[PDB]
Design a protein around this ligand. Sequence first.
Ligand code: NAD
Ligand code: NAD
Ligand code: NAD
Ligand code: NAD
Ligand code: K
Lengths: 461, 461, 461, 461
Amino acid sequence: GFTDYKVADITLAAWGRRELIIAESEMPALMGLRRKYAGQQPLKGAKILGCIHMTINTGVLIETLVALGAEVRWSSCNIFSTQDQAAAAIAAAGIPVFAWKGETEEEYEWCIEQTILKDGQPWDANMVLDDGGDLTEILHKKYPQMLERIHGITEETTTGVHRLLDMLKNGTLKVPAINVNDSVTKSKNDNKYGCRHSLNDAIKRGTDHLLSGKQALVIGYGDVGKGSSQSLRQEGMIVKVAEVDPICAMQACMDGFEVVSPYKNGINDGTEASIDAALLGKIDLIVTTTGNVNVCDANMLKALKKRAVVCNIGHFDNEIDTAFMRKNWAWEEVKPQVHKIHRTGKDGFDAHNDDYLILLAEGRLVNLGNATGHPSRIMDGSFANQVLAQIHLFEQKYADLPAAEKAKRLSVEVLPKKLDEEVALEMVKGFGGVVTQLTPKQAEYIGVSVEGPFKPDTYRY
Amino acid sequence: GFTDYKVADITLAAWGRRELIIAESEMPALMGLRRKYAGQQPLKGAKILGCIHMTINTGVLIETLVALGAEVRWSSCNIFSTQDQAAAAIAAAGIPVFAWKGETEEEYEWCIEQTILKDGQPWDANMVLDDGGDLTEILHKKYPQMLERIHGITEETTTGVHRLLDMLKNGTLKVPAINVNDSVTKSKNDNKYGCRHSLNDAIKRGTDHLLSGKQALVIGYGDVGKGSSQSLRQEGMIVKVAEVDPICAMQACMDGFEVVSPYKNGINDGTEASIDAALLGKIDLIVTTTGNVNVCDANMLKALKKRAVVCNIGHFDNEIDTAFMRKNWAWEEVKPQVHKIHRTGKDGFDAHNDDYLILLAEGRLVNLGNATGHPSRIMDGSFANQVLAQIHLFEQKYADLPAAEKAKRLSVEVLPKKLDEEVALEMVKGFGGVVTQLTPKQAEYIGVSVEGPFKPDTYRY
Amino acid sequence: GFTDYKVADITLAAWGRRELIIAESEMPALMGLRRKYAGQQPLKGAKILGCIHMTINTGVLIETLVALGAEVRWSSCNIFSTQDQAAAAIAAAGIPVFAWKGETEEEYEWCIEQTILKDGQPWDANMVLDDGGDLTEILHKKYPQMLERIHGITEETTTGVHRLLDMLKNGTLKVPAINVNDSVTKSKNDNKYGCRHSLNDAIKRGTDHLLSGKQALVIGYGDVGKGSSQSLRQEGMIVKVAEVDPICAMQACMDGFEVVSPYKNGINDGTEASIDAALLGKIDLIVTTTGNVNVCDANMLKALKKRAVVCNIGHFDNEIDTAFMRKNWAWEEVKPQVHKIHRTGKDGFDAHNDDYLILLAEGRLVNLGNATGHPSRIMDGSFANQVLAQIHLFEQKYADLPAAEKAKRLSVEVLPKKLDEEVALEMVKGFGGVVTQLTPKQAEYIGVSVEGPFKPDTYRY
Amino acid sequence: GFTDYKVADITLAAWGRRELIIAESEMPALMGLRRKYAGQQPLKGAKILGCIHMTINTGVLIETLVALGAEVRWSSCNIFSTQDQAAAAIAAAGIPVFAWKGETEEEYEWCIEQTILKDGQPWDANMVLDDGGDLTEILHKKYPQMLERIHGITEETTTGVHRLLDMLKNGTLKVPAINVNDSVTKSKNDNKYGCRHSLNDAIKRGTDHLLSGKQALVIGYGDVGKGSSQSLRQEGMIVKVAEVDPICAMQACMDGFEVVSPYKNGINDGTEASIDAALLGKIDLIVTTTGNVNVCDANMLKALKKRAVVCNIGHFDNEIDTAFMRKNWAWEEVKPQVHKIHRTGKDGFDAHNDDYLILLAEGRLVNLGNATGHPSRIMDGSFANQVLAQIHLFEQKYADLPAAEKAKRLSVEVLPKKLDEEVALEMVKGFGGVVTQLTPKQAEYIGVSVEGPFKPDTYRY
Ligand SMILES: NC(=O)c1ccc[n+]([C@@H]2O[C@H](COP(=O)([O-])OP(=O)(O)OC[C@H]3O[C@@H](n4cnc5c(N)ncnc54)[C@H](O)[C@@H]3O)[C@@H](O)[C@H]2O)c1
Ligand SMILES: NC(=O)c1ccc[n+]([C@@H]2O[C@H](COP(=O)([O-])OP(=O)(O)OC[C@H]3O[C@@H](n4cnc5c(N)ncnc54)[C@H](O)[C@@H]3O)[C@@H](O)[C@H]2O)c1
Ligand SMILES: NC(=O)c1ccc[n+]([C@@H]2O[C@H](COP(=O)([O-])OP(=O)(O)OC[C@H]3O[C@@H](n4cnc5c(N)ncnc54)[C@H](O)[C@@H]3O)[C@@H](O)[C@H]2O)c1
Ligand SMILES: NC(=O)c1ccc[n+]([C@@H]2O[C@H](COP(=O)([O-])OP(=O)(O)OC[C@H]3O[C@@H](n4cnc5c(N)ncnc54)[C@H](O)[C@@H]3O)[C@@H](O)[C@H]2O)c1
Ligand SMILES: [K+]
């Protein structure tokens, strides 16, 4: 009588387990950490509140933390990102999970609240694993007494890290954090390479549109923007890129993209007159990658080519003005996480209207909403960093320090480069790669240990 | 009656000037600095010792320094890198230059000495611009009294910066330096993007070999390694990548390369038995990108496929064991900077022998040796950074500081990110790119100025 | 009272209709033919037996034939290729269709028989539209009297055309045929470009495996082999190609692939000793593209790397020896159209066994089995040719000709180049492409009409 | 005392011979024919007039014909395409050659006349090997008595074949011809793959412009158009394609290019009003690939972006209206085969004028004019077909046939597919490729011999 969960359908558990057993074989860094730390049980006594996309790959992360001695209570950090078979398999292993694909916002907040509370009172949580900072925000705003007993937060994504750095600048951050996002084996692998794989995947599963010879506009050329632009270009899309960062824009130019603005002269003065109508009238696909607000705005959405696809692969749906479309336009569901938005008016639509946009995942993370997110062998890097981060903060035991000692340890840090390299080495062995060992003369010549680290902390890769 | 120069042929000057006038139109960041700072003359009184490849692009750099008020004495930092028409055009403008393509080592040292000495006595130099640290080493070892009057060094390349950091660690660095290499508008565009353009260029000019469907082995996957691997892959080469750094190896895997070692299990124990002879017997082309020593060693060269091409695009020729080849094997010149190395023995060779390797530029920087180096629009980024760096150190006037104040300013620094972004923006405008301006609400949301900088100094791009 | 159909679930009709209304906007050549021929009703009196994948795109073909005056009875030409929502939408429009995803072989033959028979007696069919020749074979073997009244066959695919040309060579072909496969707007668009899109799509939806930096072996480098190889290479797979045709092999080399054989020196003498076990032990994915038999044989399947993916994108499953695997090895269903094949024995498997292959769609057409086949904008070209072919043969009225006149018209022909060009132009306009008009002087200079055709019938494109 | 030649510089012979010895190692199909036919001397008594680019690769073809028993008299078919070291090496072997880089039109005609006449009277020629039909035209118009004793013409290129088929249609063709162009091992390898290698090579050697992130317009998308578009796209150019042929335009769309016309709605009426000035004002590089006349016309040249590069890789310079530019605009030589065309007027120019175009090779074949043409390993396929063609027509002995027998053999034919496959196999072995042998059951299943041919003559590859 394990009942401490809520999932779409517990009978998907056997299916979820089959996919976890496959995913294991694609995740050598994560499975390496299981084998290495199994005996030592470095997370014995850890009580982890987890808020991250309840996928099969997140399942292998959860079962790694549990194998190392942790107990967890889990939710998803997105309403559309759960794989119901993954959620079912985790619940079936006797692990509290509150996640299903297609939550309401009310259900999303309820799921996070079910991790935080056990039998209607605060859980004895002492660790937080977060992706986007929604759980971190609720603990700070609603459960400050719970943070007194928490040793730290391990934050997955750019948007979550920004929110931590704001709290730290404001003196409101209550416990230390590891920025998992800025391990090279996370930010390069997941933020960039993962989006090369999963963006075109999500747009095919959502639309089945030919992308070859069609026109895309990618907003942003950070790690997600670079991966997303490549995802489309490798399918033969004509990709244009927008940026606010001239260094990122210069990279897009050198990578073979045309750098354009949705605005005449790049000036976003909020007028319809500012919109480059000729440019947006040629676009078949717009993708937002920024982590910023309203980068695909009402006037852009009015100007887009009839039957353009619109999607967001940044963390939050507010990249796109979906509030404007809900207010002004009629939404026809094609199938789950695919809507035609009829720009003819609010009150009904003609079934044969030609004047619509296709919105994926209601503007939520499209790679998780309309596909399965990044493949296991990429999520291996991210999640091995999460396990190492959890071990590091748990072992430091911030909550048990005196006030004077807390003041010295209250920071947002990254993992050491040596760990980043050890994750990378396990990932390279999963491709059958063979890394060359430096001779002592070579190691002396470039001024590094034969064991590494191989690069100064300033190296960009 | 200007005689204070030595070049291959002064009669090439008019041709050099025609190419400078074209190169100017490709270099908007550099030409922007001319237009911005012409009036202010920020380098009035600067006396710059320059040691960097005497190309047409280096011509535009020199004439920008001179336009902003500097006097210079110039040499090349490589025996094969000079474009004799560029050297001629600079000499003909009355600028002391000592450079020609195909110097001896004795002539190379003589050319640097001719910049350092004017009329048989040390020049009143107060600035150094170096690429690889050869001029910096000579000043420190042979002319220490000259360093008392020098305000700083602006160093171009990975290898030069390593040598500076060794001097700083040892307390032997006598003047402050700017690491120009680690501006993003240098390291990304020059070290990576430039090698995508110029590596396959140099191999075509040197060999005219079909690259499509042939096997390459690229040693290293730093910025040069990445740009080099792409240069060959985009021609349809089957590229294998060797690495000591598991993070760089992981990037090569994710980029779609097989990661291999020249040694069995990556162990370089110095025996012929350690060589993967099966692997090296399949390789048509080997490129060294490391800035390390002996990464293509004698035992690798013995095992390479008959008639493989061998080249280096790292700073120094000692990446390849050319000394072994000179000692043991017979060199046939095909044409300038192309040798067949006959592995039949050290004396004669038969013109029809099938057992040879093709060496490019005698193992020197192949893109400058067998072609013209990076295109103007790439060198624009590097050289705009060099001008800003020269202005910054010259204006700081280190040599004039009191002893106590010197101690505080003796460092190896990079340029501020705002200047990096300003160079990037001028490069983007040269592609006709339009950068979007943040609204005040967007800038607040991501926590930056509308004017930038847009990223923290920890951002990797 | 319409009951003359069998589909998985009639309640999927509305969803199918929403997808048909979208697919119409992607299919300008097909929807152009509707608009052009609607008034003339050129297929009034046509009674078409259709046997082709019951997808949404096939829906737009069926409704185009019906819009031009035809009546049809439909089946799928593959047990896994049906989209149940497409089948439902067609049945709901009152069109007899006998198709669902995941038919047995017994159900497959029953569905074709339900098109051929209406109320237990032969339908008054006078046209055949076939894909692979299964319906054509049944009519010739079992219903020869029905062929007396049939005007022609329009055959979609390479394998079907081969079977027709065998019948013609043997004098057993009873009615004339159009080879739709060898229109350029079919063979290029569908056989090549379509597989660039749909192969990587099907492998992602089936496995979610990272393809980047993994090793593939593509068997064949015809049109499907070329499009398949590109599908994997553009994801950053290391693709090796097998071929029997040295001209196709030369194209694979020049395209940047290594050409290998599963057999030592290419000799398939049927011994285990002949297998290149070193090569097949490195392969992560094998794809069959040949239309030939047993090109991924028992001994190859034994030698494949543990946990390799195995799939077929040729017409028939017998490219792979799946009969050997059913006989010898235990099948674990992961999810629909995905099996683990446990090489440890027949009568059970360890749930944690590491020694398995992943088979997609039981060796059936993977792009249709594990995804949705080619996108609408590609299937537009194929299906526009099918409509024109149906019109041409129906209007020729072979079945009504005298015996002497029949003898002259009994042939397998292609559509004229002018019609091929008119399809191409409609497809170009769907990308917003603008085709240049020849001047009279230019048309004279290259010896063509300003209206085309632009190339002789020998031109290969 | 051999004096029966004219070359730039006989002293370049040793250098030419060194390059021939290297080129031979890259040309296994050609060197295979030497080894196979050496004993049999199948061209003993052949007297071949040769008109084709006097490159190193042409040198290997010449010396193959001579090795098989032929005598030759050679000229280049282009004023800029000779490699003077190749010409020197051939003259030094005692082979009559009349070729240098940078001929006048008057010199070009003189060189062809020196092959046709020996000691002021017609040579005893009995074979023609032509590339573009200039030698074929002169023999027909000026030396009809010579054609009486000639057994055939072997024609290299699209333009030459068009001219032959015009003579055949008009009944003016005097001797049979083999169309070498339409061997798959010529048209795919040379026309398409070769231009991927040599177009970007010629543009880098000529201009050293960065192509990444810059805009290209390619006129035509036949074999040369396809290879040229890829050449630029693989460098990261934004490539727009123009076509008259909707099937070729459809291919460019599917390959990921935007298809545009220099003319509004594709209509040229020869008004300035018809020019898309907005489009041509954005183009950095225009390349003509058509074999047509005036496809880059006066009004296009007026509208091109300032400092755009203009070049032609079709056979004849009349693709570009260079006559207009010679009449109206001032030509400043940058260096050999590179001009700035000053659009300010005819008389002088300002050295610092910004309103110029860069023209390569005065609009002659850019890959041969500004580089070396295709690499040896590609020219191997073309030239092996030339040798087989020469053997076939020489052995048929047309000139010796009775009039009735001539009438039956007067055609323009291709080589049999079996020979095309045998050339391909030798090229595949040069990449180390291993071609699979069909089993007897597989050969039965697809209806081919185990020895081939593998495809019907209608197959497009
Ligand atoms: N979907 C995924 O799987 C996935 C994975 C990683 C991260 N993310 C999320 O995606 C977002 C992007 O992450 P990142 O790592 O690429 O961040 P990043 O900071 O590296 O990149 C964001 C880029 O957006 C640009 N930008 C900002 N405002 C803009 C504007 N108005 N118009 C144009 N460009 C603008 C910035 O200049 C910057 O280069 C975040 O919300 C992150 O948390 C998603
Ligand atoms: N040719 C050019 O135009 C050009 C341009 C920029 C810099 N450079 C020179 O190229 C070199 C590389 O510069 P970079 O910026 O790429 O440096 P980097 O430090 O970014 O890259 C060097 C890489 O080599 C790898 N490496 C070291 N020893 C190795 C070994 N034994 N086997 C395999 N890999 C090994 C390191 O792990 C590292 O990733 C330097 O010498 C630099 O000065 C040349
Ligand atoms: N999945 C789809 O969407 C789709 C679309 C079009 C056609 N098809 C089917 O795909 C198959 C291939 O069609 P195609 O048009 O590419 O045919 P094709 O004849 O152009 O190509 C088949 C190739 O297989 C090669 N080959 C044959 N036996 C081989 C062997 N034993 N080993 C290696 N290579 C071998 C041949 O030399 C040939 O080049 C057919 O069965 C066709 O009906 C499927
Ligand atoms: N430079 C080289 O190395 C090389 C090699 C082979 C052939 N060639 C020459 O290059 C030319 C092209 O040969 P090919 O085999 O590609 O011929 P092709 O017939 O395959 O292609 C030429 C294309 O030009 C298009 N075209 C014609 N007029 C046009 C116009 N006004 N605007 C746009 N497109 C137009 C045609 O539709 C056609 O598709 C010929 O002159 C040929 O002899 C050059
Ligand atoms: K020697």
